[PDB]
């Protein structure tokens with residue numbers, strides 16, 4: 001059953017995020033970001049019933065909230081990544097310990113010529129696509145392939161300071177939410193060309209709004225966290241058509257200013 005999760009790892013955001021998190025002018029309202037982040041944690045843990053592991057903020061790591069970039073979990077195995085920005089590399093320490101306590105088999109990306117950000121990795125339920133980007137390189141992608149041996153891994157070039165999931169993510173079984181920009185469409189075609197699996201797509205006019213979270217929840221069924229109609233009205237009208245999903249609008253406007261989207265803020269785990 002694709003999208004099953006029992007546990008999520010998240011991490012509180014530091015005061016330092018407002019001035020120190022990496023970003024490609026928009027002033028960050030750190031109190032509003034904390035509010036948005038608390039609301040997102042509420043959905044995962046309270047509303048959907050996942051067991052959430054809330055990591056404490058570390059003021060020395062302005063981007064620590066973005067736990068997705070530091071770990072990729074597939075089944076009973078966790079790849080601890082080697083993030084592409086060297087300043088984010090100590091974020092792995094706390095995540096390794098949390099994933100240890102969750103009884104995952106841990107593989108650490110230690111190779112000094114390898115980098116990977118978890119935000120470059122799209123797992124479809126059938127295979128992985130891995131963005132080759134400013135943050136993820138070919139070697140990082142190879143070590144992901146070596147770690148998740150049961151699954152095919154293919155790479156796709158990603159331009160211009162983007163991550164693969166800057167413009168896509170899974171919206172359901174067999175369903176890739178994908179943005180309409182020249183970048184996103186060029187990337188989708190490459191992915192579709194490299195795989196024999198025939199995916200369906202859900203095309204949205206705002207690349208950013210293609211980053212959503214799908215879960216398959218006991219006694220709830222298909223569930224999708226997506227950006228709000230106040231943030232991306234024309235994309236929310238597209239998700240509204242998913243009549244068999246429980247749709248949950250989640251705001252992420254403040255963390256978006258330092259390139260933080262929905263998937264970025266949690267690592268999801270399915271535990272026996």
Ligand SMILES: COCCNC(=N)NCCC[C@H](N)C(=O)O
Pocket residue numbers: 021022023024063066069117118119120162163164165166211258259260261263264
């Ligand atoms: C889904 O990935 C979207 C892109 N964002 C991402 N991977 N991580 C969050 C932002 C991390 C950091 N602030 C940066 O600019 O690198």
